[PDB]
Amino acid sequence: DPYEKIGAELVKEVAKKTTTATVLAQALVREGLRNVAAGANPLGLKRGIEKAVEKVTETLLKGAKEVETKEQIAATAAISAGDQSIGDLIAEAMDKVGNEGVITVEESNTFGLQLELTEGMRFDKGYISGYFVTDPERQEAVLEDPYILLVSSKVSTVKDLLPLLEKVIGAGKPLLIIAEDVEGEALSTLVVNKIRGTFKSVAVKAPGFGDRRKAMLQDMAILTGGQVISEEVGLTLENADLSLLGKARKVVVTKDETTIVEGAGDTDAIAGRVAQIRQEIENSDSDYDREKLQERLAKLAGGVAVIKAGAATEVELKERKHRIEDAVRNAKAAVEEGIVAGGGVTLLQAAPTLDELKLEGDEATGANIVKVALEAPLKQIAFNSGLEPGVVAEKVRNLPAGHGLNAQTGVYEDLLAAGVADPVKVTRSALQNAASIAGLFLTTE
Amino acid sequence: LEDPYEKIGAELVKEVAKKTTTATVLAQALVREGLRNVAAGANPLGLKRGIEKAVEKVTETLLKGAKEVETKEQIAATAAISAGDQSIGDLIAEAMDKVGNEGVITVEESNTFGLQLELTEGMRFDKGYISGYFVTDPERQEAVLEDPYILLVSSKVSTVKDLLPLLEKVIGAGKPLLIIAEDVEGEALSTLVVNKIRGTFKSVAVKAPGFGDRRKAMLQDMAILTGGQVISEEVGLTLENADLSLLGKARKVVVTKDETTIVEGAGDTDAIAGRVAQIRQEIENSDSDYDREKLQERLAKLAGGVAVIKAGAATEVELKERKHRIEDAVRNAKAAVEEGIVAGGGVTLLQAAPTLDELKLEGDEATGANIVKVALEAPLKQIAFNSGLEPGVVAEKVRNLPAGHGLNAQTGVYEDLLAAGVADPVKVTRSALQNAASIAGLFLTTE
């Protein structure tokens, strides 16, 4: 134990950086070293673990139960949520906006969970600097009812926008600067003013590159109400009015993305822009350009669903806001790859798929270390309810593909039907993580 | 009448200047005099070196007196001359402003009667197709692909047992397939060229640019741009087991005799941005000039992009010529920017001859340099003739005209040709001389 402990504990650290994943990494590393203590080369076991995972992955992606119906989806969403009002509500949000739609959860003052489908957008671009982060706990930058500034050129000088910024301050409203880029004295002036509590802003880089990013800025302009300050279409920033700036009720900016909630753009105005693109998709001359415009239109028209959480206590709101959020991405994940049996059942009956490979020498061992780890997820559950490590594992190891032992129920019955499940992606991802962490523990130290 | 020998020799110079115009007229005169001197008992070699010393002096004289072309207004106006059109010039200056002076700038056929300018992601390198049979536009000697998948292989490809499993999954997409690998060897090659002629499966094969590690880096750069993994059996990615998930995507690929251009890849703006940052920082942690030179080079391909001037017309005759006016203009602007611009109408080479007086030469070195003094007035004297004006006469008039003033072969109105839009990239002029002197030194050596 003494060394394995100082090892496993060390494995609890790496894992905790971004729990089946965790338990598996510890179930891989120790079982790895015990074989490295026999004199088996790590690059030999690693090679056997990697290959072993590959096979275990198809096994999960093949034995996956599809999810399409507003019934099934609601169920998934309902699981992770630990609630039906959330599962039903998340299935309704995906019903409207779509499976791949933009669902935004937000904690509200009202009592019951609300849904709301408003005009809005989200693109693949986070804040330029993490200093803009308002809620450090979620490393996010939320702006309440801000003005939106669109700039197709780069912003570096402060003195060009300053006149407009002055009106924004006087407006007593925050700002979202979406420009080609925001650097230099400009970027710093924004940050400092934000820290000083002087001026509430978030800088974000436009979506794409050249012409196609300049058309997206337009979609945002139209959605938001504002008008892209383009030195080529329009004039200089000097003589500006607040009317050039779009507005929204909330802008959420994270490390990787920016969501605009309820653009102030004319509904009829957005509809026309959606139409304009709808024609380009037909007058298109390329499949590539066709698929790009399709998504561009997909956003403007798709809107942004919002799920407001019921108040009670600061501690409740927060968590409740996260649980729904998790249930959304969990239910969004299930529809993406399918679902698999709850508990550690799916991972057990995954080992007998390793035998169908070329089990050789060291690698075969590495591959066996996995057939061991795959039995770690269930072991923990058993260790919990207070049962026999081996017997629980063994008994399950026998039952038909899709039958295992739930806690609350404590019955060697069907797990999936019993309302117990895991998104294959979530399960299959855990595994790929463990292998990835175990892969550092072999090569490095 | 002209001397038979001098003609049999003047024709010979033309046909040579063909494979390798102002240079032709220039060389012909350099050779015409050399012969007369050699016949009069002058050492060829001695006569030659005198020509060389002479040219370098004139090469330096031209370059110094070059009306610097730097502002957009300038560029746009240079090109306006090479295209005899303002809008065509203005747009090129624009394309040169966003993609950068030395930046990629292609001209594409437009289904729209006008002239549009697209700016997107993408890059170009100095590597043509391995096989010419891949060509799709026999006129332009190019192989163009629509929505082409990109397969990046960091290793030479010869076998067939590995590609088929992938190529099939590609055929199902109903989409072309640009493949960049260390090379495409005889076997799999035919598999590509054949299925391509059989129209079974359209595709092209370009050899990756670079060497060893330096190359794998560029393939990675193209991986990041297009949005696809690089096939590398050493790491853990086997070509045998591959899906579209690995391959990358683009809108328009164009492969020529010795160049590949990819128009807008499918990689994320983050990914692409990271490689740019990674390189920018890599350049800063490096102190090696070679290393940093090659890094800025790779940075420009990623951060640069590609301009696409869209030239619309009706008839194919005008469409292909419109697509040449612009192309030619683009290269002139790029050239004007490199070494400056100067007065056209073959007026500078004449007004340059006096500089050779600053050169003290003895014997055949003096004669060699004095053949040039004469040869330098050839281009103008030639333009003069094809106008119906006595060559000599105009040669003298211009000689006594202000620096930059000469006969305008269009309107015949002696004036400031620079102000008259009668200019030339000193690059084009300097090279004309250099080549003319290169050919001449041949007819005064080889047998």
Coordinates of C-alpha atoms in Angstrom, one line a residue, chain B:
Chain B
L1 CA 20.3 46.8 -97.7
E2 CA 21.3 44.8 -94.6
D3 CA 24.3 42.4 -94.5
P4 CA 23.3 38.8 -95.0
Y5 CA 25.6 37.6 -92.2
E6 CA 24.3 40.3 -89.8
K7 CA 20.7 39.1 -90.6
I8 CA 21.4 35.4 -90.4
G9 CA 22.8 36.5 -87.0
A10 CA 20.0 38.9 -86.1
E11 CA 17.4 36.1 -86.7
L12 CA 19.4 33.7 -84.6
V13 CA 19.3 36.1 -81.6
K14 CA 15.5 36.4 -81.9
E15 CA 14.7 32.7 -81.8
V16 CA 17.0 32.5 -78.7
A17 CA 15.4 35.4 -76.9
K18 CA 12.1 33.6 -77.5
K19 CA 12.6 30.6 -75.2
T20 CA 14.5 32.7 -72.6
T21 CA 10.1 42.2 -76.8
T22 CA 12.5 44.9 -75.5
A23 CA 15.2 42.3 -74.5
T24 CA 15.2 41.0 -78.1
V25 CA 15.7 44.4 -79.7
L26 CA 18.3 45.2 -77.0
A27 CA 20.3 42.0 -77.4
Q28 CA 20.2 42.1 -81.2
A29 CA 21.9 45.5 -81.1
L30 CA 24.5 44.3 -78.5
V31 CA 25.3 41.4 -80.8
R32 CA 25.2 43.4 -84.0
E33 CA 28.0 45.6 -82.7
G34 CA 30.1 42.9 -81.0
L35 CA 30.4 41.2 -84.4
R36 CA 31.5 44.3 -86.2
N37 CA 34.1 44.8 -83.6
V38 CA 35.2 41.2 -83.4
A39 CA 35.6 41.3 -87.2
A40 CA 37.7 44.4 -86.8
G41 CA 40.0 42.5 -84.4
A42 CA 38.6 42.8 -80.9
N43 CA 38.8 40.1 -78.3
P44 CA 35.3 38.6 -77.7
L45 CA 36.0 37.8 -74.1
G46 CA 37.5 41.3 -73.6
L47 CA 34.6 42.8 -75.4
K48 CA 32.2 40.7 -73.3
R49 CA 33.5 41.7 -69.8
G50 CA 33.2 45.3 -71.0
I51 CA 29.5 44.6 -71.7
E52 CA 29.0 43.2 -68.2
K53 CA 30.8 46.0 -66.3
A54 CA 28.6 48.4 -68.4
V55 CA 25.3 46.8 -67.6
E56 CA 25.8 46.6 -63.8
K57 CA 26.5 50.3 -63.9
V58 CA 23.2 50.9 -65.8
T59 CA 21.4 48.4 -63.6
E60 CA 22.4 50.5 -60.6
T61 CA 21.5 53.8 -62.4
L62 CA 18.0 52.7 -63.2
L63 CA 17.2 51.4 -59.7
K64 CA 18.3 54.7 -58.0
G65 CA 16.1 56.8 -60.3
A66 CA 12.9 54.8 -59.5
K67 CA 9.7 56.7 -58.6
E68 CA 9.0 54.9 -55.3
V69 CA 5.6 53.1 -55.5
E70 CA 4.3 52.7 -51.9
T71 CA 0.8 54.2 -51.3
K72 CA -2.4 52.4 -52.3
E73 CA -3.1 55.3 -54.7
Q74 CA 0.3 54.5 -56.3
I75 CA -0.1 50.8 -56.6
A76 CA -3.7 51.2 -57.8
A77 CA -2.4 53.6 -60.5
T78 CA 0.5 51.4 -61.6
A79 CA -1.9 48.5 -62.2
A80 CA -4.4 50.8 -63.9
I81 CA -1.7 51.2 -66.6
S82 CA -1.0 47.4 -66.9
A83 CA -4.8 46.9 -67.2
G84 CA -5.6 50.1 -69.0
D85 CA -8.5 50.4 -66.5
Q86 CA -9.0 52.2 -63.2
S87 CA -11.4 49.9 -61.4
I88 CA -9.2 46.9 -62.2
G89 CA -6.3 48.9 -60.7
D90 CA -8.2 50.1 -57.7
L91 CA -9.3 46.6 -56.8
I92 CA -5.8 45.1 -57.1
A93 CA -4.4 47.8 -54.8
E94 CA -7.2 46.7 -52.4
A95 CA -6.3 43.0 -52.7
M96 CA -2.6 44.1 -52.2
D97 CA -3.7 46.1 -49.1
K98 CA -5.5 43.3 -47.3
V99 CA -3.5 40.2 -48.4
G100 CA -0.3 42.2 -48.5
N101 CA 2.0 43.2 -51.3
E102 CA 3.7 39.8 -51.6
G103 CA 0.4 38.2 -50.7
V104 CA -1.4 35.5 -52.7
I105 CA -3.8 37.0 -55.3
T106 CA -5.6 34.8 -57.8
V107 CA -8.1 35.7 -60.5
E108 CA -11.2 33.5 -60.9
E109 CA -13.9 33.2 -63.5
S110 CA -17.2 34.8 -62.5
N111 CA -20.8 33.9 -63.4
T112 CA -21.4 37.7 -62.9
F113 CA -20.8 40.5 -65.4
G114 CA -18.7 42.7 -63.1
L115 CA -15.6 42.5 -60.9
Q116 CA -15.7 41.2 -57.3
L117 CA -13.0 40.8 -54.7
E118 CA -13.2 37.9 -52.2
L119 CA -10.9 37.7 -49.2
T120 CA -10.8 34.4 -47.3
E121 CA -8.4 32.0 -45.5
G122 CA -6.0 29.8 -47.4
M123 CA -2.3 29.7 -48.5
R124 CA -0.1 28.9 -51.5
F125 CA 3.3 27.1 -51.9
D126 CA 5.9 26.5 -54.6
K127 CA 4.9 23.0 -55.4
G128 CA 3.0 21.9 -58.6
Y129 CA 1.5 18.5 -59.5
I130 CA 3.7 15.4 -59.5
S131 CA 2.0 14.3 -62.7
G132 CA 0.7 16.6 -65.4
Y133 CA -2.1 14.2 -66.5
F134 CA -3.9 15.6 -63.4
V135 CA -4.6 18.8 -65.3
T136 CA -8.3 19.9 -65.8
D137 CA -7.8 23.1 -67.7
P138 CA -5.5 22.3 -70.6
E139 CA -5.5 25.9 -71.7
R140 CA -4.2 27.2 -68.4
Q141 CA -2.4 24.0 -67.7
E142 CA -4.0 23.8 -64.3
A143 CA -5.9 21.2 -62.3
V144 CA -8.8 22.9 -60.4
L145 CA -10.9 21.2 -57.7
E146 CA -14.3 22.0 -56.4
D147 CA -15.0 21.4 -52.7
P148 CA -11.8 19.2 -52.6
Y149 CA -11.0 17.0 -49.6
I150 CA -7.4 17.2 -48.4
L151 CA -5.4 14.2 -47.3
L152 CA -2.1 15.1 -45.6
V153 CA 0.4 12.3 -45.5
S154 CA 3.8 12.8 -43.8
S155 CA 5.4 9.9 -45.7
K156 CA 5.8 8.7 -49.3
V157 CA 2.8 6.8 -50.7
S158 CA 3.4 3.9 -53.1
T159 CA 1.2 0.9 -52.1
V160 CA -2.4 0.5 -52.9
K161 CA -3.6 -1.6 -50.0
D162 CA -3.9 1.5 -47.7
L163 CA -5.5 4.2 -49.8
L164 CA -8.5 2.3 -51.2
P165 CA -10.1 1.8 -47.8
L166 CA -10.0 5.6 -47.5
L167 CA -10.6 6.6 -51.1
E168 CA -13.8 4.6 -51.2
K169 CA -15.1 6.5 -48.1
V170 CA -14.2 9.6 -50.1
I171 CA -15.9 8.5 -53.3
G172 CA -19.1 8.0 -51.3
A173 CA -19.0 11.8 -50.5
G174 CA -18.9 12.6 -54.2
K175 CA -16.1 15.0 -53.7
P176 CA -12.5 15.4 -55.1
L177 CA -9.4 14.7 -53.1
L178 CA -6.2 16.8 -53.0
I179 CA -3.4 14.7 -51.5
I180 CA -0.2 16.2 -50.1
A181 CA 2.3 13.5 -49.2
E182 CA 6.1 13.2 -49.2
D183 CA 5.6 12.0 -52.8
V184 CA 3.1 9.9 -54.8
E185 CA 5.0 6.9 -56.2
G186 CA 4.4 5.1 -59.6
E187 CA 1.8 2.5 -58.3
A188 CA -0.8 4.4 -56.2
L189 CA 0.0 7.2 -58.7
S190 CA -1.6 5.4 -61.6
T191 CA -4.4 4.4 -59.4
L192 CA -5.0 8.1 -59.0
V193 CA -4.3 9.3 -62.6
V194 CA -6.3 6.4 -64.0
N195 CA -9.5 6.7 -61.9
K196 CA -9.1 10.4 -62.7
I197 CA -9.3 9.8 -66.5
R198 CA -11.9 7.1 -66.0
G199 CA -13.7 9.8 -64.0
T200 CA -14.1 7.2 -61.4
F201 CA -12.6 9.4 -58.8
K202 CA -11.3 12.9 -59.5
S203 CA -8.1 13.8 -57.6
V204 CA -4.7 15.4 -57.7
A205 CA -1.2 14.8 -56.2
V206 CA 1.2 17.4 -55.0
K207 CA 4.6 16.8 -53.4
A208 CA 4.9 18.5 -50.0
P209 CA 7.3 21.6 -49.8
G210 CA 10.3 21.5 -47.5
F211 CA 12.7 18.9 -46.0
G212 CA 12.5 16.5 -43.0
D213 CA 11.3 18.1 -39.8
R214 CA 11.0 21.5 -41.6
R215 CA 8.4 19.9 -43.9
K216 CA 6.3 18.0 -41.4
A217 CA 5.8 21.4 -39.8
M218 CA 4.4 22.9 -43.0
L219 CA 2.1 19.9 -43.4
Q220 CA 0.9 20.5 -39.9
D221 CA 0.4 24.1 -40.9
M222 CA -1.8 22.9 -43.7
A223 CA -3.4 20.4 -41.4
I224 CA -4.4 23.3 -39.0
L225 CA -5.6 25.4 -41.9
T226 CA -7.7 22.8 -43.6
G227 CA -8.9 21.2 -40.4
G228 CA -7.5 17.6 -40.8
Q229 CA -5.0 15.4 -39.1
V230 CA -1.8 14.5 -40.9
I231 CA -1.4 10.8 -41.6
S232 CA 1.7 9.6 -39.8
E233 CA 2.3 5.9 -39.1
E234 CA 5.2 6.8 -36.7
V235 CA 2.8 8.6 -34.3
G236 CA -0.3 6.4 -34.2
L237 CA -2.5 7.5 -37.2
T238 CA -2.8 4.8 -39.8
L239 CA -3.9 5.7 -43.4
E240 CA -5.4 2.2 -43.6
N241 CA -7.9 3.1 -40.8
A242 CA -9.1 6.6 -41.8
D243 CA -12.4 8.5 -42.2
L244 CA -13.4 12.0 -43.4
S245 CA -13.0 12.9 -39.8
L246 CA -9.2 12.9 -40.6
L247 CA -9.3 14.5 -44.0
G248 CA -9.6 18.3 -44.3
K249 CA -11.9 20.6 -46.4
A250 CA -11.6 23.6 -48.7
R251 CA -13.6 25.6 -51.2
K252 CA -11.3 25.7 -54.2
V253 CA -7.9 24.0 -54.9
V254 CA -5.7 25.0 -57.8
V255 CA -2.6 23.1 -58.8
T256 CA -0.3 24.3 -61.5
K257 CA 3.1 23.3 -63.1
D258 CA 4.9 24.4 -59.9
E259 CA 2.4 25.9 -57.4
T260 CA -0.5 24.8 -55.2
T261 CA -3.2 27.3 -53.9
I262 CA -5.8 26.3 -51.3
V263 CA -8.8 28.6 -51.0
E264 CA -10.3 28.7 -47.4
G265 CA -9.8 25.6 -45.3
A266 CA -12.2 24.2 -42.7
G267 CA -10.1 24.5 -39.5
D268 CA -11.4 26.4 -36.5
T269 CA -10.5 30.1 -36.1
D270 CA -9.0 29.2 -32.7
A271 CA -6.9 26.3 -34.0
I272 CA -5.6 28.4 -36.9
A273 CA -5.1 31.3 -34.4
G274 CA -3.1 29.1 -32.1
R275 CA -0.7 28.0 -34.7
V276 CA -0.2 31.6 -35.6
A277 CA 0.5 32.5 -32.0
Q278 CA 2.6 29.4 -31.5
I279 CA 4.7 30.5 -34.5
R280 CA 4.8 34.1 -33.4
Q281 CA 6.1 33.1 -30.0
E282 CA 8.4 30.5 -31.5
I283 CA 10.0 33.3 -33.6
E284 CA 10.6 35.3 -30.4
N285 CA 12.3 32.4 -28.6
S286 CA 14.5 32.0 -31.6
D287 CA 17.6 34.1 -32.3
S288 CA 18.6 32.1 -35.4
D289 CA 18.0 34.2 -38.5
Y290 CA 17.4 31.2 -40.7
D291 CA 14.9 29.8 -38.2
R292 CA 13.1 33.1 -37.8
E293 CA 13.1 33.7 -41.5
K294 CA 11.4 30.4 -42.2
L295 CA 9.0 31.0 -39.4
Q296 CA 7.8 34.4 -40.6
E297 CA 7.5 32.7 -44.0
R298 CA 5.1 30.0 -42.5
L299 CA 3.3 32.7 -40.6
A300 CA 2.6 34.7 -43.8
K301 CA 0.9 31.7 -45.4
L302 CA -1.4 31.2 -42.4
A303 CA -2.0 34.8 -41.3
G304 CA -1.9 36.1 -44.9
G305 CA -4.9 34.5 -46.6
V306 CA -5.8 34.7 -50.3
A307 CA -7.4 37.4 -52.4
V308 CA -9.7 36.4 -55.3
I309 CA -10.5 39.0 -57.9
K310 CA -13.6 37.8 -59.7
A311 CA -13.6 38.7 -63.3
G312 CA -17.0 38.4 -65.1
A313 CA -17.6 38.8 -68.8
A314 CA -19.7 37.3 -71.6
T315 CA -17.7 35.9 -74.5
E316 CA -14.8 33.5 -73.6
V317 CA -12.5 35.7 -75.7
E318 CA -13.0 38.6 -73.3
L319 CA -13.3 36.5 -70.2
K320 CA -9.8 34.9 -70.8
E321 CA -8.3 38.3 -71.7
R322 CA -9.9 40.0 -68.8
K323 CA -8.4 37.2 -66.7
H324 CA -5.0 38.1 -68.2
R325 CA -5.2 41.9 -68.0
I326 CA -5.7 41.6 -64.2
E327 CA -3.1 38.8 -63.7
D328 CA -0.5 40.8 -65.7
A329 CA -1.5 44.0 -63.7
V330 CA -1.1 42.2 -60.4
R331 CA 2.4 41.1 -61.3
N332 CA 3.3 44.6 -62.5
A333 CA 2.1 46.3 -59.3
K334 CA 4.0 43.6 -57.3
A335 CA 7.0 44.5 -59.4
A336 CA 6.6 48.3 -59.2
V337 CA 6.6 47.9 -55.4
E338 CA 9.9 45.8 -55.5
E339 CA 12.3 48.1 -57.3
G340 CA 10.2 51.2 -58.2
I341 CA 8.8 52.4 -61.4
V342 CA 10.3 54.5 -64.2
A343 CA 9.4 56.3 -67.5
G344 CA 8.2 53.9 -70.2
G345 CA 8.4 54.2 -74.0
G346 CA 12.0 53.0 -73.8
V347 CA 13.1 56.5 -72.7
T348 CA 15.0 55.5 -69.6
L349 CA 17.4 53.1 -71.2
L350 CA 18.4 55.9 -73.5
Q351 CA 18.7 58.6 -70.9
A352 CA 20.7 56.1 -68.9
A353 CA 23.5 55.7 -71.5
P354 CA 25.4 58.9 -70.3
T355 CA 25.9 57.2 -66.9
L356 CA 28.5 55.0 -68.6
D357 CA 30.7 58.0 -69.0
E358 CA 31.2 57.8 -65.2
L359 CA 32.9 54.5 -66.0
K360 CA 36.6 54.6 -66.8
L361 CA 37.3 51.6 -69.2
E362 CA 40.3 50.8 -71.3
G363 CA 40.5 48.8 -74.5
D364 CA 37.8 46.2 -75.1
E365 CA 36.2 47.0 -71.8
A366 CA 35.6 50.4 -73.2
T367 CA 34.2 49.1 -76.5
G368 CA 32.1 46.5 -74.6
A369 CA 30.6 49.4 -72.6
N370 CA 30.2 51.5 -75.7
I371 CA 28.2 48.9 -77.5
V372 CA 25.8 49.2 -74.6
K373 CA 25.7 53.0 -74.9
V374 CA 24.4 52.4 -78.4
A375 CA 22.3 49.3 -77.6
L376 CA 20.5 51.3 -74.9
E377 CA 18.8 53.5 -77.6
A378 CA 17.6 50.4 -79.4
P379 CA 14.2 49.9 -77.7
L380 CA 13.2 53.6 -78.4
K381 CA 14.6 53.6 -81.9
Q382 CA 12.6 50.5 -82.5
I383 CA 9.3 51.9 -81.1
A384 CA 10.0 54.9 -83.3
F385 CA 10.3 52.8 -86.4
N386 CA 7.0 50.9 -85.9
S387 CA 5.4 54.3 -85.7
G388 CA 6.5 55.5 -89.2
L389 CA 8.9 58.0 -87.7
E390 CA 12.6 58.1 -88.6
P391 CA 14.3 56.2 -85.7
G392 CA 17.4 58.4 -85.7
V393 CA 15.5 61.6 -85.6
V394 CA 13.4 60.7 -82.5
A395 CA 16.5 59.2 -80.9
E396 CA 18.0 62.6 -81.0
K397 CA 14.9 64.5 -80.0
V398 CA 14.5 62.4 -76.9
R399 CA 18.2 62.5 -76.1
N400 CA 17.8 66.3 -75.8
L401 CA 14.5 66.1 -74.0
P402 CA 14.0 66.4 -70.2
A403 CA 14.7 63.3 -68.0
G404 CA 11.5 61.4 -68.3
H405 CA 10.1 63.1 -71.4
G406 CA 9.8 61.2 -74.7
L407 CA 7.7 60.2 -77.7
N408 CA 4.3 58.7 -76.8
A409 CA 3.7 56.0 -79.4
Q410 CA 0.0 56.2 -78.7
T411 CA -0.6 59.9 -79.4
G412 CA 2.8 61.0 -80.7
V413 CA 2.8 63.9 -78.3
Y414 CA 6.2 64.4 -76.8
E415 CA 5.6 64.9 -73.0
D416 CA 6.1 63.5 -69.5
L417 CA 5.4 59.8 -70.1
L418 CA 5.4 59.2 -66.4
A419 CA 2.5 61.7 -66.1
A420 CA 1.0 60.2 -69.3
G421 CA 0.6 56.8 -67.8
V422 CA 3.5 55.5 -69.9
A423 CA 5.5 53.7 -67.3
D424 CA 7.3 50.4 -66.7
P425 CA 8.5 48.5 -63.6
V426 CA 12.3 49.0 -63.5
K427 CA 12.3 45.3 -62.6
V428 CA 11.0 44.5 -66.1
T429 CA 13.4 47.0 -67.7
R430 CA 16.5 46.1 -65.7
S431 CA 15.9 42.4 -66.5
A432 CA 15.4 43.2 -70.2
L433 CA 19.0 44.5 -70.3
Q434 CA 20.5 41.9 -68.1
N435 CA 19.0 39.2 -70.3
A436 CA 20.0 40.9 -73.5
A437 CA 23.6 41.1 -72.2
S438 CA 23.4 37.4 -71.2
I439 CA 22.4 36.3 -74.6
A440 CA 25.0 38.5 -76.3
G441 CA 27.8 37.2 -74.2
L442 CA 26.8 33.8 -75.6
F443 CA 27.0 34.8 -79.3
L444 CA 30.5 36.0 -78.4
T445 CA 31.6 32.7 -76.8
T446 CA 29.7 29.5 -77.7
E447 CA 30.1 27.9 -81.2

